[PDB]
Design a protein around this ligand. Structure first.
Ligand SMILES: [Cl-]
Ligand SMILES: [Cl-]
Ligand SMILES: [Cl-]
Ligand SMILES: [Cl-]
Ligand SMILES: [Cl-]
Ligand SMILES: [Cl-]
Ligand SMILES: [Cl-]
Ligand SMILES: [Cl-]
Ligand SMILES: [Cl-]
Ligand SMILES: [Cl-]
Lengths: 304, 304, 304, 307, 307, 307
């Protein structure tokens, strides 16, 4: 009654994770033993979410409540900012384990599914996503936020649709300014993503933005590493010299202008940054504390 | 529904084997714990075969499905080529564990059971198997292949009968050529078995056959080791000099001609080899790469 | 049906013992795990006896069959020869665990129970057992043999009564010879017990008997160690010099003649020995091979 | 030769907590079996912190590192913006483990140590820091940067001195403007700090600064939460109502003007804002408790409306 | 003194997989208890391969051999027929563990190493191996036999040289026939190889050879699967339809003639077949996907009928 | 300082078997936990035999003794009555472990060793032992007693010699009677042995002896089971019907007279019986398969009636 304890099970939680949350919250006495019960009975299909449980509630009543998903708040699909479709796919299958990563990736790039989004969100997803130079059409169109779903075994299509919708809803406030600058949504999101992937912790994004706009204006290549990493389709730390020679239109070391599309989704500061850049004469920047230099010399003479 | 996983349990699988296949296939989380469940409840009578299972299927529902043998494909009794009745008996009891090896061996050599085969497969099993010099009448008559059975607790007689039948069915294609060369089935199978036991991996069986026919024709003893090993009734690696003195009609070091019967069952290449030997003047061969020498000298001068 | 396995559980078997017999006989796969099941469910009241069990019989069906005592042959109370009432009491409580040793010992020496035996078996248990010099009246009257009982929670009185009855039944054959030599049952059993406790493995009991009769006849004390050990009420190996001074009528080092009664029950050879001693002039003997010497000197000069 | 996984064990973590983090991070295979090891051997004295572990690392070694507390020692001493002396003390202890937190705090506030700084950097640290109402004299005077030391048992005094020197060196460019506006280094760093703690990453700090100056010129209290939190010497995110009543000169809800000194150190961004604010009519500001987008409103009603 | 059981741990085997193989092979008694040992001690870095273990061998030793990967080192280097340079590279590494697979492959294809062979064995390895269209110049030139080396850190070059020398020595008997038919050693070894990969043990290779020659004389492509598999540098059993479309001069479904070079080494049986085929009218052949009995049919219809 | 418990591990004991005997004997507390230790460490090579263990003895030591087979070594070599050479061989090996059973048996039957005994003890071991029909020449000639040896690696020959010497010394008292009855030492020891194996402890051996002599004088076969069992070289309790048909001169069901030699050694009791039997008309005897009380009946019917 008033002896209730509210536990929170994040999406993608292992059996040990669940067991340990239950012990931390005093619902059960020993995490190992609960893990043993689960594996012994093969009750591994536990649903994430928030549950109202009580101490000395029989182990089977607990497990059964979790297998039936009788929650007080649903499981949370958290999609962070700076994520590629591939990374988002990892989260989706960790959240809805009956889905397989290869199928989710197939749906995201499916011509018929992509066309449905173009039709359903015409002012956000346009024919621009169909450029043959783009690797994955919806890259950058799945918005960073937490999502929940009421259905059972929800499809990858339903899940992805909500992430496109959130993008449509959340950039509505930027729409008049996009029209004022005659900037397509696609380019807006492209610029935001390159700003997103370079932006450190507390670094000023509006300055980073100004460096990229300044370079576009003077016909200098953006020479931004996260685009090369994206072309090679990998989420690694550094980029070697051999990587700088990757033959891809996303390679901003060998191609002038913005890449064919975004390389990830973006946060609001990166979006504000793209639309309202700072006015400066900076053409270079180095990350870690971020030093903006305005000449060829100052930058090269600012190593170590 | 579409969440089904097909698992395959080979005949003779231990509890650990079963447990591990279940973990490999993602039906259960932990092999040790399933092993523990089985032994704790004493549910050790699990039937081999193929099952349609799903993840998070309760452990008892899994075990119960395996105890009742509710399979999508039956258990497979695999009898390899080059096997003696004794080895086949090992497989039979591993496949149908309510049978005891001593009883299976008794049935194989039972006068009344042997006579029934002579009557049921008259063109394959003839009075030749009744020669008092033969150790085990049906040696070589149980064909190498995979067998399945629908009945419950099938008798050793039913099982053995099918292996005799398969021999009858599969040598039907060689029957006209046997008549053409006036070669009894018994001798055909005898020759095939000695070819089978000498044949290495990729060695040419038709040459080995020609050496044995050449020796028969010149009244030389076959001097083939697997026959001595057979006489001593053991499945060992080497044959010592004291073994070469075993007093048995199967001993081709002390008796001229083919032994009284086969020393094992044979594959199709060994059978083709027996009926269609190569024409050559080779009288010796040494195994490991197989070198055929055509004179007394060349062989002795080809050691190490 | 024909898959039955007969297991034998001796009286006094621990849980490990039971578990191990079940594994040895192939009824279960693992003794430890069965032990775990028993202790986990607290099903420790398993009845000894012989059971018809089968492999893959569910653990609970096995335990339940043993808790209900549904045996094919009852539990065996084995009483060996050369046992004191105290040792017999150990066996009784190990066989019928609801009884307590202190109560069983109380019943054995109870005046009213002793009198009932005198009344029920008048030609075997007589007033001689009431001599105030006797430590335990029925000492030696409980016969060595295996006993079984059909009742539930049988009383110590019922159990002891059967051991007195067996003595009455089994010495019936010696009765005419006892009358011929005018030897009371009490003395007969007393002599048998001292012969029983000295008798080694293959030593001749009729010679030992003759030494004790020879000593009685010449008024020499029997000087037999097991009587001193009995007086001190202990089942130990050796007897120190301080033990030889125990002030008890059972002490045959300080009292002439037979002790007041038996110091244990006896086997048939010891009984035959008491009634039909050998004729000799031996007055001493030393145990280990047993050397009988006929003079004071020969014995003392036969150490080490 | 081996791959290194950094794991973090939070303070107050139970044995199950630790086991499960190891399994999550793929250093061990099974959290239960690890819990059993710890209990069986009775190795329950496991220290919280950051460790560099390897998968397949023998269980004994893992446990032995946590028992002894052989945690990740940073190659360099990094001091970020918006940090108080207490937090700097942590980064210092983490970097030079032979030093104890209590001593480093004492050195910071040691009258003789503070007097030596007033003597060594007279243009930067002046008698202003000795004002009776200041909690910690050098609060705000240890510059945010990356420092390294050649020495072996580097003392807290040596380290702190390098941070005070960095401040002195790095504000040299603002000297001319400070002299022109007649703003003391102390009031300068005070504004900078209240600006620093109120700005999310991308916020326009020059507007935040203008609000404060506007309030200051209009005799309106600054009412900035970070100053309340600093008053309580507490590193939390939100302030309660009871906190707003705290008796302290640092409480800008109860006192007009700037607090007696800075509440943290500041980045160049904030320093520029302090000296070069924007000329505007804004007197209120609110950052979304979601996006971190700062909205400046001219009047009290406009501000309240944003709930 | 002790009995030795060889166990095989396949690549990608889980801990349960390993435990159960040990129990199956009777090296340990209980797979569960072994899994627990591995997890408790955190000895999860167990290398795949072949090991010589003994029953009753202390658990620590077992695990220690697998961790260190102290696998069965063959006394001799055996190279069977039908092997490609990649497979020879494995047998070499297994035999001389100090050598790495990547280097052995590089040596095989090293322009300077190949030129040295053309110089050392001029009657056997000629400029033919330097044809632009060949994947690996020495493919087919390393003879199948058993080799042994007295040396200590025998180099890949020494080893490969002995195999090339064996080829040179062992084809000496075919020289006279090659000269008479004017068949280069290179085309000789090419035929031999396509014959080798198409014959089950007992099949009549001289008929297989006649089919190929017949097709060759009739301008019919050889359409032999093994050449397609070799084109993909893949050691599988069956070829899919997508594989038959692979763009490569080695693809005998898309190009007439023999491939640019051999696809493996060959046994004497195949070599005889190449030089002494049977005179016949067969143009197709099919081996049972069951018995391995090869059926030669004269026409296209007769062939198709065997499904 | 410590209490010692002797435990016995029978041949073919499983790990559970061993664990449970240890628990029964109170050397360990819990059979399960011990089984787990054995399996976890993979110490499954536990030798059968008799061990002196102590309670609280560290588990590792217990297991280590059984692995190495460091069993209870008797201080002295005791040879009881009714023992055959095979059984004596066991007592010898148990006492002097460096010796192997197969060698001790060979020495016993070694022609040169036997000839040396015929030479060293000519009054006792004569050419009679070399009779073609005897299984083991010295069967019955190794006296039952307790022996001890000062030597270090005492040989089987030295040991056997002492037992043959004991026989020679200890039958000296019967010499005069043997000469008077003209009974060879060999027939003497033969009777003694068949008398020995047929007597329970307290049975009157002089009556058993009279039966045999009576049968012998009446040309009735002795039909004594122990001779049949000895014929089969088997140490069992009961003889089956198939055993009674065994082809051997030792089989007294198929041959008249005494067997070719003794079937074991004998105690003085049996020896006296052989030389001084009782004069009686008994021709049959039966010992209860319960009490071991021997009943002698004069005729065939009286005997059969006792079923
Ligand atoms: Cl607990
Ligand atoms: Cl697990
Ligand atoms: Cl087991
Ligand atoms: Cl349980
Ligand atoms: Cl349960
Ligand atoms: Cl696990
Ligand atoms: Cl086991
Ligand atoms: Cl442990
Ligand atoms: Cl341990
Ligand atoms: Cl316990």
């Amino acid at each position: 009654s008033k002896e209730k304890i509210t536990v929170e099970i994040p999406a993608g939680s292992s059996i040990s994770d669940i067991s340990t949350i239950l012990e931390d919250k005093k619902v059960i006495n020993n995490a190992s033993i609960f893990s043993f019960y689960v594996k012994y009975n093969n009750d591994t299909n536990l649903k994430a979410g928030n549950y109202e449980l009580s101490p000395a509630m029989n182990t089977d009543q607990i497990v059964k409540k979790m297998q039936e998903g009788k929650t007080v708040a649903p499981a949370k699909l958290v999609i962070p900012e700076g994520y590629t479709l591939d990374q988002i796919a990892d989260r989706i299958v960790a959240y809805q384990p009956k889905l397989k990563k290869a199928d989710v990736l197939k749906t995201m790039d499916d011509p018929e599914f992509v066309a449905s989004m173009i039709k359903a969100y015409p002012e956000t997803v346009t024919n621009d996503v169909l450029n043959k130079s783009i690797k994955h059409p919806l890259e950058g169109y799945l918005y960073p936020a937490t999502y929940t779903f009421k259905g059972t075994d929800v499809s990858a299509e339903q899940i992805i649709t909500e992430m496109v919708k959130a993008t449509d809803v959340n950039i509505a406030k930027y729409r008049d300014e996009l029209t004022k600058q005659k900037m397509s949504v696609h380019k807006f999101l492209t610029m935001s993503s390159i700003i997103e992937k370079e932006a450190t912790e507390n670094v000023d994004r509006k300055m980073i933005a100004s460096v990229f706009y300044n370079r576009l204006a003077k016909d200098m290549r953006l020479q931004t590493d996260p685009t090369v990493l994206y072309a090679l389709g990998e989420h690694k730390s550094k980029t070697t010299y051999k990587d700088l020679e990757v033959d891809s239109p996303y390679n901003t070391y060998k191609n002038n202008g913005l890449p064919p599309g975004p390389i990830s989704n973006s946060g609001d500061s990166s979006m504000e940054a793209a639309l309202y850049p700072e006015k400066s004469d900076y053409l270079y920047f180095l990350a870690n504390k971020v030093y903006f230099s305005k000449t060829l010399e100052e930058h090269n003479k600012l190593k170590e």
